[PDB]
Amino acid sequence: MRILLSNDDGVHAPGIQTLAKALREFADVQVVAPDRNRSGASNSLTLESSLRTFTFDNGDIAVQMGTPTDCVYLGVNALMRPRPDIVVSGINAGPNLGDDVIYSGTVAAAMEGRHLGFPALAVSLNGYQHYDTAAAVTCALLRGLSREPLTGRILNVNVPDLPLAQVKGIRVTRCGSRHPADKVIPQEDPRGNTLYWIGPPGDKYDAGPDTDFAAVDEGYVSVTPLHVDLTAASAHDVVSDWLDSVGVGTQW
Amino acid sequence: SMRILLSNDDGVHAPGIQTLAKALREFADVQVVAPDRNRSGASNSLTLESSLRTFTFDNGDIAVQMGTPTDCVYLGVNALMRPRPDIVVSGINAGPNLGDDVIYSGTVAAAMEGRHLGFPALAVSLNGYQHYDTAAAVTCALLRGLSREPLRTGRILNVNVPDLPLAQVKGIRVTRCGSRHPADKVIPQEDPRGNTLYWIGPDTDFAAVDEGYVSVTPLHVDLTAASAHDVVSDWLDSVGVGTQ
Ligand SMILES: [Mg+2]
Ligand SMILES: [Mg+2]
């Protein structure tokens, strides 16, 4: 099996390195990842710019200031030969759940993979410690794909930050929007300045049975068959009719 | 009358948001909640479990320190504007948000965060850096249009305004998002040191703007399919638990 492995956290990240080592047990892996951490950066293709690459002794390739999508696009069309069987993104440091999948770099890489024509998977750890757990989950998932090739959608995977033995299973999920347990909690700093803290005062619950949120709350691996489509083709007529009805733009 | 949460991507100081704010305060109740800095080229995720500091300006505008556009809208909608906003408006952005650019756009991200409100959210971008007055006039017309006849929610309108005087705007068209990406390729290049450097429709938003029309694209969040949910679940139960 041939894997194009990228991430959002960059080539030296523990998530991608833990995943790369576990995958090389059964698969041939090409890493093409950003040269540095990209979590805070936009995830679009860098158009009309000459991107420099760096090749390490182990074969990993770093794209200088490349986004996750740059890495997949350059990997597919220039850097990886022979071409990959599947594009993998992760393991991300932190969850990619609900509305955040629209904005996630980890997700964006997998999406670019699918747009280019390859099966694609994105993996995220809901925490900071148990990358081994997330690695084991990804390997088991990729085993299944080798045995039974699969949808023109990506698989968005979220893993609880727990030892592997405590993960209560794997669920096929839909995406939530924002978590009902998250709240705006007012805070003050030592200087008396106003601060706001977004999240749960206690445990995260009431998320909804089949959401990606709930699955992770209940200690389950969340798997979402995902395709970020923002278009609203059915709404075109209703907006047209509304503009004529109220006469918007007809008063200039 | 209307309660408008106004945010953007360019930050609280941007000429686009400042022009728009002034215009909207003529007929509406406006609260600015915007990033403390320009966020173009930054990611748009929600900042969870990390305290966000706010600055309040003399005029009542609120800046969120290291706040993403979604942080601003989330905070505005749920804490900073009371009673709750009827609508989120995001812009006026300096530069277009057309076609392939909309997914990663901070301007559109802010609107998307405000999509569950009483009115659909507006993301407004000027196709340039000059005629902010035009884009503000367009936004005002849209808002009044929603007052007279409310349009349904869970949705946003992505609005791109041509960088022209208002008298030169040819009209307003409902469009779809274009895509120039299925035409891109990779052309290698030679550095002076030697190393290789790699280089990457009539109803489209691009076309409307190019022809001097304001582009209005309805957007909706669609992520999953019920048939995909079934085909993955049966694919999972093919290879289950075990102890092997
Ligand atoms: Mg990251
Ligand atoms: Mg901007």
Residue numbers in the entry:
A (entry chain B): 1 to 150, 152 to 253
B (entry chain A): 0 to 199, 209 to 252
The authors write:
SurE is one of the several proteins that gets expressed when bacterial cells are subjected to environmental stresses and in the stationary growth phase of bacteria. SurE has been shown to possess phosphatase activity and appears to be specific to nucleoside monophosphates. The StSurE protomer has a Rossmann fold like structure similar to those of its thermophilic homologs. The crystal structure of StSurE reveals that the C-terminal helices of the two protomers of the dimer are swapped.
Examination of the sequences of this segment in StSurE and PaSurE suggested that D230 and H234 of StSurE might be the key residues responsible for C-terminal helix swapping. The structure of H234A StSurE could not be determined by molecular replacement with acceptable scores using the Phaser program and StSurE monomer or dimer as phasing models. The final model of H234A StSurE consists of a dimer in the asymmetric unit with 244 residues (out of 253+14 N-terminal tag) in chain A, 252 residues in chain B, seven molecules of ethylene glycol (added as cryo-protectant), 248 water molecules and two magnesium ions. In both mutants, the two protomers of the asymmetric unit are related by a rotation of 167°. D230 OD2– H234 NE2 hydrogen bond is lost in the mutants. In chain A of H234A, D230 carboxylate is hydrogen bonded to H228 ND1 (2.90 Å). In the mutant dimers, the hinge regions of the two chains are closer (Cαs of D230s are at ∼ 5 Å). This leads to the formation of several new hydrogen bonds involving D230 in H234A (D230 O/A - D230 N/B (2.85 Å) and D230 N/A – D230 O/B (3.04 Å)). The 5% activity of H234A might be due to the presence in solution of a small fraction of molecules with a dimeric organization similar to that of the wild type enzyme.
